[PDB]
Amino acid sequence: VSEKEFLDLPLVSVAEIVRCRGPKVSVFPFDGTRRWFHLECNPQYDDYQQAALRQSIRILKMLFEHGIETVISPIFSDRYIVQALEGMALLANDEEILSFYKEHEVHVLFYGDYKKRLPSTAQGAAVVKSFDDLTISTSSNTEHRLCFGVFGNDAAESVAQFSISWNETHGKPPTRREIIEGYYGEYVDKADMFIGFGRFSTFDFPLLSSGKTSLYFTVAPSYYMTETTLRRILYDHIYLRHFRPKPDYSAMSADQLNVLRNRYRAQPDRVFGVGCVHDGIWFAE
Amino acid sequence: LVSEKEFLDLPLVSVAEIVRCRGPKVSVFPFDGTRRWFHLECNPQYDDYQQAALRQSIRILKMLFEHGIETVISPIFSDRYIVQALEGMALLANDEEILSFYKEHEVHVLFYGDYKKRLPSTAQGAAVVKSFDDLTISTSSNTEHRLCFGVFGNDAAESVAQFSISWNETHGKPPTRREIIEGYYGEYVDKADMFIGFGRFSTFDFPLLSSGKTSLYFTVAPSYYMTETTLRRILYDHIYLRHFRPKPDYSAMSADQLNVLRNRYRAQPDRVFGVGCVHDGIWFA
Ligand SMILES: [Hg+2]
Ligand SMILES: [Hg+2]
Ligand SMILES: [Hg+2]
Ligand SMILES: [Hg+2]
Ligand SMILES: [Hg+2]
Ligand SMILES: [Hg+2]
Ligand SMILES: [Hg+2]
Ligand SMILES: [Hg+2]
Ligand SMILES: [Hg+2]
Ligand SMILES: [Hg+2]
Ligand SMILES: [Hg+2]
Ligand SMILES: [Hg+2]
């Protein structure tokens, strides 16, 4: 199949293909949101939290409708932490997003070191409580998994303590699967893709990174993401990353090999990720 | 403080001064695209692949260390017959030219990963493992640089589990993050500062050390086409461009700056780095 045919597909057909070929697990932190907010909304009159939440919901809905089973979205990571508290509480208390979870049969989970890192206040305790109640409440949903990262950047010590307790309880060391279940709440084998933004970087999906995880970096802030963009990414992941057969270099004509060869010898300094800063902003070249 | 051209133009000593100052302290650099490189640059039946490859590996590691990078992490083998990989592995601990390299450039060499369990239980496999151990003892008096070779170093969860259980049993309490990193790698490093990849946008095999601050790069040409210029464009980007200050003040921008940004982000198709194209059976970013 070609790209245009994929783009032209009905949503249901696309979704069938994604449930078939993957990605089963997409990591998608919503990035560049401040820039987005300053370009698309009115900063002193519009509320940043609510505008952001609406965009988040639009995109999570788009991802789940395209057949992606699990989305991992880092929310907060290593100015006042109390400010982040409100935005967080929205994820468990906003009526529209609750309506969304129920309608799309989404199971919501939270991962990371938040219980210890969040402030020891009535407020922080309240958010943590919201998280537990939301994960319990949506646990009967079976169609999609949504995993919110809150201080979910480094799981080493968490995994150490979990493994120690596990050994004392069950008499033996936990498996990789059991470790992943202990950290995330449920099991998934790996991340199939990470959709990043701006400066080429990935973060906050511990235990799940692999050389098979397809990496993408949008130029525009995450909230500009359309169906067509998402589908170009999906098309690359499904049809282009594991393209077969592997190149038989020995079956190529001398002109083919020469084209490749002279290209690599002429510009051996072409590096994706090397950018340029203009007007205070980094742009990939 | 500097433009790209000025950086490219600096004497090696000055570049190394800057790198010791601003980082990267730790670069992850798997040598990738080596089959393509070898078929483009060499004559498959008449040139020896092991030594052509080894020669390039040494050139690049030497280049990296001379530019002031303290620690290089290089994934070697990662999840055809495993016995085939054994020879290439043994070269890293037995080839006289590379041992001479470790000596002249004062490199401490370490091996990480699940290799002791995953390598074949044969005289050959055990010989390779023992040579890894002995190389690490033999170079442990070198202090100027750290070189870490990954052999099945793709997934550290169960290794960390067992390590932590054992640690708690003996060394009295749960091991700290630092202690876990030391247990897995042999020594301590805070994080990876950059990853230099190739072709399809992907990273792999540096467990425990990935951060949102890890700068990501992907060369178009196979690793062995790397020159000083390539390396330095990478270094310039990492050092001067990724952490550029001040942060953009969108509210201080003219209507034209916002308009340009805005119409760039609104325009379709929008550039997604990582979405490639396959021509002649090969993926191109
Ligand atoms: Hg503002
Ligand atoms: Hg769905
Ligand atoms: Hg679930
Ligand atoms: Hg749950
Ligand atoms: Hg998850
Ligand atoms: Hg248990
Ligand atoms: Hg621009
Ligand atoms: Hg060949
Ligand atoms: Hg050096
Ligand atoms: Hg050392
Ligand atoms: Hg290391
Ligand atoms: Hg081409």
Swiss-Prot record, chain A:
GO terms for MF: (13S)-vitexifolin A synthase activity; phosphatase activity; transferase activity, transferring alkyl or aryl (other than methyl) groups
Cofactor binding, per record: Can also use Fe(2+), Cu(2+), Mn(2+), Zn(2+) and Ni(2+).
BP-aspect Gene Ontology terms: diterpenoid biosynthetic process; tuberculosinol biosynthetic process
Residues spanning the signal sequence: none
Consequence recorded when altering residue 48 to F: Strong decrease in TOH and iso-TOH production. Almost loss of TOH and TOH production
E.C. numbers: 2.5.1.153
Effect of residue 35 to A: Does not affect TOH production. Strong decrease in iso-TOH production
Reaction(s) catalysed by this chain's protein: tuberculosinyl diphosphate + adenosine + H(+) = 1-tuberculosinyladenosine + diphosphate; tuberculosinyl diphosphate + H2O = tuberculosinol + diphosphate; tuberculosinyl diphosphate + H2O = (13R)-edaxadiene + diphosphate; tuberculosinyl diphosphate + H2O = (13S)-edaxadiene + diphosphate
Family: Belongs to the diterpene synthase family.
Further comment: 1-TbAd is highly prevalent among patient-derived M.tuberculosis strains, where it is among the most abundant lipids produced.
Role according to the record: Tuberculosinyl transferase that catalyzes the condensation of adenosine and tuberculosinyl diphosphate (TbPP) to generate 1-tuberculosinyladenosine (1-TbAd), which acts as an antiacid that directly protects M.tuberculosis from acid pH and physically remodels M.tuberculosis phagolysosomes. In addition, acts as a phosphatase that catalyzes the diphosphate-removal from TbPP to produce both tuberculosinol (TOH) and isotuberculosinol (iso-TOH). Has broad substrate specificity, and can also use the 3 labdadienyl diphosphates, copalyl diphosphate (CDP), ent-CDP and syn-CDP in vitro.
Protein name: Tuberculosinyl adenosine transferase
Source organism (scientific name): Mycobacterium tuberculosis (strain ATCC 25618 / H37Rv)
UniProtKB/Swiss-Prot annotation, chain B:
Effect of residue 79 to N: Significant decrease in phosphatase activity. Loss of phosphatase activity
Entry-linked Gene3D superfamilies: Decaprenyl diphosphate synthase-like
Annotated thermal dependence: Optimum temperature is 45 degrees Celsius. No activity is detected above 50 degrees Celsius.
Cofactor requirements of the protein: Mg(2+)
Catalytic function, reaction form: tuberculosinyl diphosphate + adenosine + H(+) = 1-tuberculosinyladenosine + diphosphate; tuberculosinyl diphosphate + H2O = tuberculosinol + diphosphate; tuberculosinyl diphosphate + H2O = (13R)-edaxadiene + diphosphate; tuberculosinyl diphosphate + H2O = (13S)-edaxadiene + diphosphate
Regions crossing the membrane: none
Outcome following mutation: residue 49 to F: Strong decrease in TOH and iso-TOH production. Almost loss of TOH and TOH production
Annotated effect of mutating residue 32 to A: Abolishes transferase activity. Decrease in TOH production. Almost loss of iso-TOH production
Keyword Zinc-finger: no
EC assignment: 2.5.1.153
GO MF, one annotated term: phosphatase activity
UniProt-reported outcome of changing residue 32 to N: Abolishes transferase activity
Textual note on the cofactor: Can also use Fe(2+), Cu(2+), Mn(2+), Zn(2+) and Ni(2+).
Keywords per UniProt: Transferase, Virulence
Record note on disruption phenotype: Deletion of the gene abolishes 1-TbAd biosynthesis and decreases the formation of swollen phagosomes.
Keyword Transferase among UniProt keywords: yes
Activity regulation annotation text: Inhibited by the bisphosphonate inhibitor BPH-629.
pH dependence: Optimum pH is 7. It is active in a pH range of 5.5-9.0.
GO BP, sorted A to Z: diterpenoid biosynthetic process; tuberculosinol biosynthetic process
Quaternary structure (record): Homodimer.
General remark: 1-TbAd is highly prevalent among patient-derived M.tuberculosis strains, where it is among the most abundant lipids produced.
Family according to the record: Belongs to the diterpene synthase family.
Known function: Tuberculosinyl transferase that catalyzes the condensation of adenosine and tuberculosinyl diphosphate (TbPP) to generate 1-tuberculosinyladenosine (1-TbAd), which acts as an antiacid that directly protects M.tuberculosis from acid pH and physically remodels M.tuberculosis phagolysosomes. In addition, acts as a phosphatase that catalyzes the diphosphate-removal from TbPP to produce both tuberculosinol (TOH) and isotuberculosinol (iso-TOH). Has broad substrate specificity, and can also use the 3 labdadienyl diphosphates, copalyl diphosphate (CDP), ent-CDP and syn-CDP in vitro.
Protein name (database record): Tuberculosinyl adenosine transferase
Organism annotation: Mycobacterium tuberculosis (strain ATCC 25618 / H37Rv)
